[PDB]
Design an enzyme around this catalytic site. Sequence first.
Site, mmCIF file in Angstrom:
data_model
loop_
_atom_site.group_PDB
_atom_site.id
_atom_site.type_symbol
_atom_site.label_atom_id
_atom_site.label_comp_id
_atom_site.label_asym_id
_atom_site.label_seq_id
_atom_site.Cartn_x
_atom_site.Cartn_y
_atom_site.Cartn_z
ATOM 1 N N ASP A 278 -6.717 -50.232 -8.209
ATOM 2 C CA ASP A 278 -6.919 -48.874 -8.822
ATOM 3 C C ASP A 278 -7.853 -48.891 -10.038
ATOM 4 O O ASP A 278 -8.071 -47.858 -10.691
ATOM 5 C CB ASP A 278 -5.568 -48.164 -9.192
ATOM 6 C CG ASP A 278 -4.859 -48.460 -10.570
ATOM 7 O OD1 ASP A 278 -5.408 -49.093 -11.569
ATOM 8 O OD2 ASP A 278 -3.656 -48.034 -10.786
ATOM 9 N N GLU B 64 -5.866 -53.360 -12.545
ATOM 10 C CA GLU B 64 -4.913 -52.498 -11.853
ATOM 11 C C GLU B 64 -3.909 -51.936 -12.858
ATOM 12 O O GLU B 64 -3.628 -52.507 -13.906
ATOM 13 C CB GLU B 64 -4.177 -53.291 -10.764
ATOM 14 C CG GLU B 64 -2.966 -52.551 -10.184
ATOM 15 C CD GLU B 64 -3.281 -51.746 -8.913
ATOM 16 O OE1 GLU B 64 -2.822 -50.563 -8.766
ATOM 17 O OE2 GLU B 64 -4.006 -52.236 -7.968
ATOM 18 N N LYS C 259 -0.030 -50.147 -13.284
ATOM 19 C CA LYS C 259 1.288 -50.012 -12.670
ATOM 20 C C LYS C 259 2.261 -49.280 -13.598
ATOM 21 O O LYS C 259 2.165 -49.385 -14.823
ATOM 22 C CB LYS C 259 1.884 -51.396 -12.412
ATOM 23 C CG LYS C 259 1.010 -52.269 -11.519
ATOM 24 C CD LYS C 259 1.070 -51.854 -10.050
ATOM 25 C CE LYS C 259 0.195 -52.726 -9.151
ATOM 26 N NZ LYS C 259 -0.398 -51.982 -8.032
HETATM 27 MN MN LIG Z 1 -1.990 -48.618 -9.464
#
Ligand SMILES: [Mn+2]
EC number: 3.1.21.4
Lengths: 261, 261
Positions: free
Chosen positions: A75, A95, A97
């Site tokens: 991402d 990334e 989270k």
């Molecule tokens: Mn993500």
Amino acid sequence: SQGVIGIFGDYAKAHDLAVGEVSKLVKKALSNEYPQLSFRYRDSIKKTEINEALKKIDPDLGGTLFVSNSSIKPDGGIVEVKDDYGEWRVVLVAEAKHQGKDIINIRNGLLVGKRGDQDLMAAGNAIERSHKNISEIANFMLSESHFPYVLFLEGSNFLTENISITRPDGRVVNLEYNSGILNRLDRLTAANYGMPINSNLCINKFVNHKDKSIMLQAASIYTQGDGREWDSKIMFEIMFDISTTSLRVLGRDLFEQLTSK
Amino acid sequence: SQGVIGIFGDYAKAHDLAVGEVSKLVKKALSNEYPQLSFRYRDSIKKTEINEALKKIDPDLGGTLFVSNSSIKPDGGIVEVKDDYGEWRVVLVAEAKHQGKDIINIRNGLLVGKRGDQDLMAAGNAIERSHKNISEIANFMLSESHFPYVLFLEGSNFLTENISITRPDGRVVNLEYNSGILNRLDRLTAANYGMPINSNLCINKFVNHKDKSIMLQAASIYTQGDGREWDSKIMFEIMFDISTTSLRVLGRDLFEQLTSK
DNA sequence: TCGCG
DNA sequence: AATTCGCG
DNA sequence: TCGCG
DNA sequence: AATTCGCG
Ligand SMILES: [Mn+2]
Ligand SMILES: [Mn+2]
């Protein structure tokens, strides 16, 4: 901080860029600093690329694929440089989270749990997913000496200090940062071999044991310890720090164009 | 097959033992074969053990822990031998994962999906969790030359051949094993570096690149390709195969007691 | 459409 | 995505 | 109880 | 555990 990367930083804070859009701003800023070098940003890299990358190290590696069009999209995307041999060398991959609604739930008086009586919510284990992509990009870069993977965490399940949230009826909740009922941080510490959390672990450690010397690839794992959300400026500055280090280790293969263009 | 391990196998098939209970039967059978060696089975191993194991390789490794009583319990447990120096050397660790109700859903006429019209169910990504424990035990054994991690898969999301399930109104469903709408097998192939799937990858590959030589630790990943469930006998025989290989690589440190007790 | 998240 | 809850 | 799954 | 679905 250092001059121009301060302007870029304030820009990220001004619009609260998601990690993807910040990752592109790192491409932006890097290209303002190294105008001889050629940076590309991409939102995907696919299992064929990884596989061929693996095969180039050992003819027995990377020989699998079940779903042909298989990709992985961190991402945060992938930022790259072109080296002196036209090859592309990944400078960054990031990334983001989330885990742990608890702070919001407490903040709004909503009690959770099967029987509506629970102030806290038994922490689940989805964050273990983060390990796959790390394994992928670590395999992709199995021939490099740098591993510029930055994972950004936030949520009640990733507290690093002790915080007390106050629910609407004036009541406070002591949130104990080291509770297994809450903290899932240990679910990630396998990725950087138990080295520091909020730290640039980009340059690979070459540990040994017998005659068997081995290389280690440690994801840089950052947290918002106080359970709050990330400052888009700080996220950017970290990502910039990692990528510059990534370039520093790549400097053998970036000399000619940096000194001849 | 070879004599006595055939009796043990039929025993596992006779009661359809879960992987945990089969893992204990491997301890059983191994101890019938190597009565000089001392096997232990345990259902947990904890982050302190891993951490100290890491520190013994590098004083900068394994220095993290947020939840003190942190453990990892692979659903297959850990089987061990005691070596000639009283130390314990892990011979096996196994886990069992499921994903993909599709075959059962089709079989019973229940159409899925948000609007009740979907014959198939868009495959999710939980199986990426399997990578953490692999990273843990791979770190635990960062000083070994063998990695006896066996992961057992089953469900519609792990088909390796093409199967057609027939829903109650006589209708069949062509299930295409290589669909990204279904097959999640590629979500695991980072663990064994893209080497064979149903294969003993216990002995570590020592690949190189520059002067930088490196060791690789490949989880052995087995599947029930036809979407059916596992034969408890076959599961056992694999687990036995892996553990014996694990002993073969440990034979330097098992000589004295095997030849003097 | 497929497939990742 | 990333959650809810069950099992000791 | 805590914490893994 | 391991699911449902959203996004391209
Ligand atoms: Mn993500
Ligand atoms: Mn399991």
